Amino acid sequence: SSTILVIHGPNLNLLGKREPEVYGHLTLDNINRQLIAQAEQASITLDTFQSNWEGAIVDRIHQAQTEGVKLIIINPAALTHTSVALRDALLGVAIPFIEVHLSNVHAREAFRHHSYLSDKAIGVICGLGAKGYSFALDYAIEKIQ
Template sequence: MPSRNLLFINGPNLNLLGTREPHIYGSTTLPDVEAAAKQQAASLSISLATFQSNHEGAIVDRIQAARDEGVDAIVINPGAFTHTSVAIRDALLGVGIPYVELHVSNVHAREEWRRHSYFTDKAVAMVCGMGGSRVHGGY
């Protein structure tokens, strides 16, 4: 049975989409991405909640709250926390909610240090390099 209650989390600096290094991240803003994702989810009768924070602890708190809310799956772009956050990884594993790791840019074609992720090995899937507007649904 497909998930019906999804949580879409965006980490640090993703609030700057549309203005931050548009040659890498594109010109689509986070509100545009979230609106398109919500529209796509609604067309599939899926509830989609969104959350963005530049603070690691706030993301951990949001992930932990997701279990009590009955979230079926999480889509997360951990941003720079991809390469540093054992705390967010542990929160995802601790709640037992399946998750998809998402990145706007192709992290594998960038700096060597961006190629390491604390999330990929436990993710249901990992999507990267599709930009902010090239994938149907906005992300």
């Protein structure tokens, strides 16, 4: 076993609401099951977390260090542009991470072009929807096994 932790930032729980025509058929829950199954197939243990509170996410990352997590896949969402605390949490624990965004962040408002995490991440994926998570997982698996 070699645990991988997936973290979802604020507002991701909004999943899929008013489904036709607001780019949300699938729900976070759907994304998590898919990921757990994908990890399940490669004999790797995988946990997922989400919260709208920054502190909750930071506490989770610390817990991850004590639990021997080898790699974090994180979609910080809004936090990417605002939280240095989150960056320090990932740096302080020294667990390698991949940053994931569903939507293309560079196609949005200018303040969305700045990240406190990207420069320290192994790699980033943006705009490929939920597949982005899958791709990150696939990479993370090769990296360990």
